[PDB]
Design a binder for this molecule. Structure first.
Ligand SMILES: *C(=N)C1(NC(=O)[C@@H]2Cc3ccc(c(Cl)c3)OC/C=C/CCc3ccccc3C(=O)N2)CC1
Ligand SMILES: *C(=N)C1(NC(=O)[C@@H]2Cc3ccc(c(Cl)c3)OC/C=C/CCc3ccccc3C(=O)N2)CC1
Lengths: 217, 215
C-alpha cells in the first residue's frame, strides 16, 4: 500500500451529511462506501439514499433510527436489487414506510467483503479499494466534542463499537504521527469540517479495524 | 380557468438555475417543463441536465451554447429514450463533447404539444398542465436591470423572440401577470422570477411559441 491516501481528492467522496436526531450512522457509512465504489465503476459521483436503507432494510436485520449494520445494508441492496439516489428518496430523519422505486435506483452490489481485523489489512484495503465502512467506539464525551489534531482517547474500547463511519484515507504529520481520515455523519460544523483524524497503529484504537467492510460493485 | 396559478406552491418547480456566459436559455426552459411533467407523473421532483441537452441534441437542430429552440430539445428526449439528471451530467456553461449515459436517465416524453398563438389558450395550458416552455423578446433594458412589478416594455416585439423561459403560473393584483421562471440566477428579478404583462396584446410574444412535453 501507499504511505498517504485521501479519496476526497479523487472525487470519490460526497460532501458531509448530517444524520440528526436519528440513529442511522450505519446507513451513512454504507452509502459512503457504496458511493465511492459506484464512482470507481461508473466515474459519476451520485449521492445515495440513506433513507432508502433506514426504511426498507429492516427485514435484513436493521433497526431504522435505533441502530444497524453496514453489511446488512449491503445485503439489503443486493436482495432488493438496488438503491435510489439521495435526490429521489430524501433523508427525512425518522424511520418511515418503504417507498423504494426501482426507476430511480442508481447503485447496486453483489455482496460485501470483510477485511481481516488488523490495522495493516485495513490499510491495504483503504489503498486498493476506496473508502471503507468501519465501526468505532464513539461513546466518549471527548468524541461528541471533537475539534482537530489526531484523536486518541485512553478509555476507548477495541471490541465494543457503537458508531458506523467511513474511512477516506490516512497519512502522517514527530511523535505518534499516523492517522485514519474518518468521515462522520454529524454535519460540517463538527470536527475538521465533519472529519476526524483517528490514531492509526496504536493497538487498533477505538476498534476501527474490528468491523471493517465494503460492497462489491 | 382558476383566478390565479402557481406550480411552485405544488412542488412542480426546481430552484432557479443560472445559464452563465452561455446561450443555453432554450435548454433551461426545456428542462423546466420536463421537470414539471415528471413530477406530475411520479411524485418525485428531479433536476435535469441542461448540459446533456446542450451537448447532445445537436442532431435535432440545436446550436450548442450559441442558441437553440425548446422543441428540438423535447424532440431529443423522445429520439433518445430518456434524459440524465443534473447530478450525473453537471452544467459546465460551455459547449463540450457529448457524454450521455442511459444508466442515469430520470425523464421521458411521448412527444410534445404546441399551444395556439393566443394568450387565452396559454392561460388554460398553465392551469390544466403545469409549467409551460415559452419564448419572449428580452433584448430590452427594463428586463435586464429589472427588480420588481408587472413588466411592460412599450417597444417589445410580438413576432421576434430570442429568449426561452418557463411559465409556472399567472395571477391578478383590472390587472394581470405571467409568472415566468428565468435562468439568470436567484440574484435577478424576483428570486430569478419575472411577472410578464398578461392578456395585453400578447406582450413580448409570450403565447407565440408555447409548448409542453407529454408523458
Ligand atoms: C449509529 N448512530 C448508531 N450505531 C449503530 O447503528 C451501530 C453501528 C455499529 C456498531 C458495531 C459494529 C458495526 Cl458494523 C456497526 O460492529 C459489530 C457490531 C456489533 C453490534 C452492532 C449492531 C448489531 C445489530 C444492530 C445494531 C448494531 C449497532 O449497535 N450498530 C445508532 C447509534
Ligand atoms: C438564449 N440565451 C438565446 N436565445 C435562443 O437560443 C432562442 C430561444 C427561442 C427563440 C425563439 C423561439 C423559441 Cl421556441 C426559442 O421561437 C421562434 C423561433 C426562433 C428561431 C431562432 C433560433 C434559430 C436557431 C437557433 C437558435 C434560435 C434562437 O435564437 N433561439 C441564445 C440567446
Amino acid at each position: 500500500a501507499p504511505r498517504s491516501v485521501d479519496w476526497r481528492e479523487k472525487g470519490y467522496v460526497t460532501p458531509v451529511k448530517n444524520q440528526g436526531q436519528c440513529g442511522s450512522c450505519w446507513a451513512f457509512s454504507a452509502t459512503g462506501a457504496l458511493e465511492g465504489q459506484m464512482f470507481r465503476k461508473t466515474g459519476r459521483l451520485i449521492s445515495l439514499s440513506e433513507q432508502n436503507l433506514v426504511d426498507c432494510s429492516g427485514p435484513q436485520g436493521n433497526e431504522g433510527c435505533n441502530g444497524g449494520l453496514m453489511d446488512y445494508a449491503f445485503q439489503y441492496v443486493q436482495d432488493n436489487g438496488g438503491l435510489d439516489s439521495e435526490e429521489s428518496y430524501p433523508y427525512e430523519a425518522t424511520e418511515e414506510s418503504c417507498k423504494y422505486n426501482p426507476k430511480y435506483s442508481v447503485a447496486n452490489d453483489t455482496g460485501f467483503v470483510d477485511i481481516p481485523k488488523q490495522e495493516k489489512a485495513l490499510m491495504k484495503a483503504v489503498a486498493t479499494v476506496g473508502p471503507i465502512s468501519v465501526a468505532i467506539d464513539a461513546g466518549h464525551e471527548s468524541f461528541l466534542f471533537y475539534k482537530e489534531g489526531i484523536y486518541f482517547e485512553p478509555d476507548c474500547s477495541s471490541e465494543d463499537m457503537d458508531h458506523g463511519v467511513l474511512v477516506v484515507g490516512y497519512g502522517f504529520e514527530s511523535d505518534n504521527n499516523k492517522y485514519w481520515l474518518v468521515k462522520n455523519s454529524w454535519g460540517e460544523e463538527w470536527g475538521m469540517g465533519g472529519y476526524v483524524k483517528m490514531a492509526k497503529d496504536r493497538r487498533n484504537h477505538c476498534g476501527i479495524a474490528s468491523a471493517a467492510s465494503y460492497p462489491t460493485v
